[PDB]
Design a protein around this ligand. Structure first.
Ligand SMILES: CN(C)CC[C@H](CSc1ccccc1)Nc1ccc(S(=O)(=O)NC(=O)c2ccc(N3CCN(Cc4cccc(-c5ccccc5)c4)CC3)cc2)cc1[N+](=O)[O-]
Ligand SMILES: CN(C)CC[C@H](CSc1ccccc1)Nc1ccc(S(=O)(=O)NC(=O)c2ccc(N3CCN(Cc4cccc(-c5ccccc5)c4)CC3)cc2)cc1[N+](=O)[O-]
Ligand SMILES: [Cl-]
Lengths: 138, 140
């Protein structure tokens, strides 16, 4: 419940500041958050290109999110392209709130979970899983 | 495994929104305001915080009664948001000390002590002072 989630969240944070972690799941979350910030800093110019090639409206269809993201994996999966996929989704959500349509955020989140579980999870499983991501780029 | 992936999506998106001054949900907004409050506390009161972190010696045997005895001291004169933040900072420093000393099992014990102390001793004041929602208003 509420108080428990607050405790876990705060402790995960304080631990992460010293390079430690609350749980394997927290370690994955924190590593992904961190890889995203670093991706966005290292590829700032390119980040812009990817995010200005999709305007989200309440009209845009999933199949169209899918074909943009497909362009990103035009070279097949690696961990960095997966991080880029998360950053792309994140930038979509931010633009949606900028444009006063935070109601789109939950749809984008569903789209991301769909793409992840359909296309990407089978690769992730084959490549050591998220725990392996943490070992490499955590 | 897709529940995991879903959780990951939400976590990442909550993070990116928070960086632009937005929030995934109210609970996410409290989470961020409390993290940031703890950072600012530890910065503004670093000397008292630092001394406290050099004075930490816990063992796998330490009991919840002892922890409750220590934070009772923090709250002797009353509860306020500030001391609640200090309580969280305290817990975090305990966990970091436990891991420093390779006592991983103490980490989940401490979490439960904190939740127990919050639910039992702090929740009434929190509810009577406007809920975490009011914390976010004041210090978010
Ligand atoms: C701990 N710290 C100090 C170090 C962390 C370290 C660096 S921080 C980072 C994070 C993510 C990616 C890259 C770097 N971490 C890291 C390092 C390496 C890998 S990795 O080796 O696995 N990957 C890459 O190095 C890599 C992956 C993707 C990259 N971009 C950059 C450009 N962007 C443009 C783009 C947009 C749209 C379409 C196309 C397109 C269309 C059609 C055809 C082709 C392309 C192209 C596409 C994706 C660029 C590099 C993965 C990770 N990591 O996961 O953390
Ligand atoms: C948004 N931004 C830009 C500004 C946010 C602003 C400042 S940032 C902050 C955060 C927390 C506390 C104080 C300041 N925010 C804020 C401001 C005011 C309040 S307030 O008016 O309500 N309160 C206090 O001002 C206040 C409360 C308690 C204070 N001290 C300092 C003395 N110190 C002794 C100590 C130190 C360390 C550990 C223990 C300890 C721990 C466990 C066991 C035994 C001992 C004991 C603990 C208690 C000191 C000040 C609460 C909050 N706020 O919630 O954010
Ligand atoms: Cl103690």
């Amino acid at each position: 419940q509420s108080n428990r989630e607050l405790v876990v969240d705060f402790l995960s944070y304080k631990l992460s500041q010293k390079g430690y972690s609350w749980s394997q799941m927290a370690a994955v979350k924190q590593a992904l958050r961190e890889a995203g910030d670093e991706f966005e800093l290292r590829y700032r110019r390119a980040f812009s290109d990817l995010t200005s090639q999709l305007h989200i409206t309440p009209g845009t269809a999933y199949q169209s999110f899918e074909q943009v993201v497909n362009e990103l994996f035009r070279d097949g999966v690696n961990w960095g392209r997966i991080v880029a996929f998360f950053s792309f989704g994140g930038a979509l959500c931010v633009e949606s709130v900028d444009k006063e349509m935070q109601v789109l955020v939950s749809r984008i989140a569903a789209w991301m979970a769909t793409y992840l579980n359909d296309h990407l999870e089978p690769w992730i499983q084959e490549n050591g899983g998220w725990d392996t991501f943490v070992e490499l780029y955590g």
